[PDB]
Design a protein around this ligand. Structure first.
Ligand SMILES: [Mg+2]
Ligand SMILES: [Mg+2]
Ligand SMILES: [Mg+2]
Ligand SMILES: [Mg+2]
Ligand SMILES: [Mg+2]
Ligand SMILES: [Mg+2]
Ligand SMILES: [Mg+2]
Ligand SMILES: [Mg+2]
Ligand SMILES: [Zn+2]
Lengths: 69, 25, 181, 83, 120
RNA sequence: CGCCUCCUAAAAGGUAACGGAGGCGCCCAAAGGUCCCCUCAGGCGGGACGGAAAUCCGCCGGAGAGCGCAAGGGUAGAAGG
RNA sequence: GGCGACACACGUGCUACAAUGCCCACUACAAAGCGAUGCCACCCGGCAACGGGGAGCUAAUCGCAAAAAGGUGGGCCCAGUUCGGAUUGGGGUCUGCAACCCGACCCCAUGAAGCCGGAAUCGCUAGUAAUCGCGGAUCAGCCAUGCCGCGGUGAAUACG
């Protein structure tokens, strides 16, 4: 490349919120992070993350069918 | 906060009770 | 030569799977990931060359190699841009420096896009290549939020030796790109 | 709103006709002078006309409109712009 | 800390710094600190990182916020749209909804006073 | 009213009219010498702030770009960058 | 259905623009009125509106009813910032046959404009100005920040 102007690439170990140790060579020797390829909800299964709701309960608001038959 | 529903004297001004001004001694 | 993970992940996961799915008969008929390009287009640097050096330092911090300017080729009346006036900052990525950047991107930076609903799989040119753009630079773990100044973001051009769009689709998906279905 | 200790749709005027037309099919238009009708989810797929003060507005029904009343789909005021 | 997606709090006393999160107020933050077991009166300069991780795996999981509370509210507005609903048409014309006086000032909802030529 | 470019100009040169159309009376120490390197304008798709074109990515494009300035000749196997 | 419509304009009021300030926990100090189709002590359930029981009261003996500012302690560190709440979504309480174009409340989260207001203009000469809360009328409920009374702390100035 060109010498003296380009940065140097050092071993970089990224620690995650779940404790994942990511194994790269980069421009800072130890990295803190808060996500990885596993904690992001789109990556792995999506596991009814926060919703458990098909919609708001439009056709499900009945809460007891109480009328005259 | 005489109009704020989530402070003390807003509940005192309208005379309504709840979390932010309960009546208990 | 280096023990970068996505290169070996390519060779042992995505390289035979693309032979299996499409029926390749030569080892170089597989799609190959070469010449990742970043142009970080700073059209807001018409009046200032001092933001350009900080953006060059940040780009050299996140990819390991220092970008070049892009000189304007053609002046316009609406947007000042006379002859020169450097308002761009282009860097291309090769030879284990695209791979560490793709590790950074796919594992850290893309989950730090806000709500990150997926990608656009319709963003294919027709001849095996792909382009995407980033909004903020704080998604990369090398950007520190206390050495930052401004809301400077990115356009990434990734090139593949694939002939069609469906080949690069399966190469990007299996190597770790989070497209929408 | 209506208290959840009690029910909803206290109008036996409209319930009889909509349940008879549910059991019969043949999705015929019914004209009702009752905006206080909170729409039962059995009313999905019927042409209901609500009288808003001058005229009836024909209201097609799909699955999404349940807790809304029928006057929430019946405008009683026409403005058309300041100028 | 680096807790609510990428929009972060810092700087002096989490018990009001959690209130800056879109979807985390004061009493919800009090519930979050009561179940986690952390000091309200401590500050975010000086705390254990395990407290941070436990606060994260509390708050970004047990409620919805970050970049989808805005999506839920916008989808609820579009739910009110497109059908002929009254409050959706009030949201359409830029007009207030919850039984308001619009003869005089509704300029919270309407915008600035668009002062007109005012005949007679 | 002097000079330059095309036509009138009848395929060498030349050729008039108060004939048809345009300019020039400057500039460049880099817009010169040499050496080395690069090839345009557009069109089709793709891409944060980018819209018909601020910058980039892939394909087609023998010269329609450019060559300071009017026009002509010429030119990418360079005189262009 | 309308008197609540709204691109605007005017008058009268409420809440603020903060540190003589805000929030939280505890602790005091009144006056004037109201109520057996009602006022509800006190328990249980709910973070809460409130609900289920049920004592008392024809009421200077019962209840409304905590009065607030005040006082003690702690937190906020002056930044559109736990000042300020507009506005908006969801979930609930009471009334009324019915609360959507038209209610009042409770909870969550959004949390705006406003960091002292141009020409001008208003009230006040002693408990008066200012500030703070309470009760009545109507009223099934209530848009009551309106009106009428009640009391707590308590200025400044008036050469002419
Ligand atoms: Mg070397
Ligand atoms: Mg928030
Ligand atoms: Mg000749
Ligand atoms: Mg001749
Ligand atoms: Mg001339
Ligand atoms: Mg394009
Ligand atoms: Mg020329
Ligand atoms: Mg009126
Ligand atoms: Zn993780």
């Amino acid at each position: 490349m060109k010498e003296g102007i380009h940065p140097k690439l050092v071993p970089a170990r990224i620690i995650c919120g779940c404790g994942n140790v990511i194994e790269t060579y980069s421009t800072k020797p130890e990295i803190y992070v808060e996500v990885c390829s596993k904690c992001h909800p789109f990556y792995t299964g999506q596991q009814r993350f926060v919703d458990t709701e098909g919609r708001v309960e439009r056709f499900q608001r009945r809460y007891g069918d109480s009328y005259r038959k | 906060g005489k109009g704020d529903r989530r402070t003390r004297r807003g509940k005192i001004w309208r005379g309504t009770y709840g979390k932010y001004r309960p009546r208990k001694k | 030569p280096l023990d970068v993970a996505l290169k070996r992940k390519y060779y042992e996961e995505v390289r035979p799977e693309l032979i299996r799915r499409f029926g390749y008969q030569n080892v170089w008929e597989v799609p190959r990931l070469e010449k990742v390009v970043i142009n970080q287009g700073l059209g807001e640097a018409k009046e200032d060359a001092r933001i350009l050096e900080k953006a060059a330092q940040e780009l050299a911090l996140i990819t390991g190699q220092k970008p070049a300017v892009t000189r304007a080729k053609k002046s316009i009346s609406n947007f000042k841009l006379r002859k020169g006036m450097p308002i761009g900052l282009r860097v291309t990525l090769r030879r284990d420096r695209m791979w560490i950047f793709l590790e950074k991107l796919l594992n850290v930076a893309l989950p730090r896009i806000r709500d990150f609903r997926g990608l656009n799989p319709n963003s294919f040119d027709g001849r095996g290549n792909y382009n995407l753009g980033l909004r903020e630079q704080l998604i990369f773990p090398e950007i520190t939020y206390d050495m930052v100044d401004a809301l400077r973001g990115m356009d990434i051009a990734v090139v593949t030796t694939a002939e069609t769009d469906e080949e690069a689709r399966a190469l990007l998906e299996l190597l770790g790109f989070p497209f929408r279905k | 709103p209506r208290s959840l200790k009690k029910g909803v749709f206290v109008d036996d005027h409209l319930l009889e006709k909509v349940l008879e037309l549910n059991a019969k099919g043949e999705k015929r238009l019914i004209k009702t002078w009752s905006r206080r009708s909170t729409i039962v989810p059995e009313m999905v797929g019927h042409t209901i006309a609500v009288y808003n003060g001058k005229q009836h507005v024909p209201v097609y029904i799909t699955e999404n409109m349940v807790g809304h009343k029928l006057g929430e789909f019946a405008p009683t005021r026409t403005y058309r712009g300041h100028g | 800390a680096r807790i609510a997606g990428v929009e972060i709090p810092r700087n002096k006393r989490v018990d009001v710094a959690l209130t800056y999160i879109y979807g985390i107020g004061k009493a919800r933050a009090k519930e979050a600190l009561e179940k986690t077991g952390i000091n309200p009166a401590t500050r975010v300069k000086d705390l254990t990182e395990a407290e941070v991780v436990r606060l994260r795996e509390y708050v970004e999981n047990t409620w919805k916020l970050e970049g989808e509370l805005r999506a839920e509210v916008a989808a609820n507005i579009k739910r009110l749209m497109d059908i002929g609903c009254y409050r959706g048409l009030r949201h359409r014309r830029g007009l207030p909804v919850r039984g308001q006086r619009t003869r005089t000032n509704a300029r919270t909802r309407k915008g600035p006073r668009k002062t007109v030529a005012g005949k007679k």
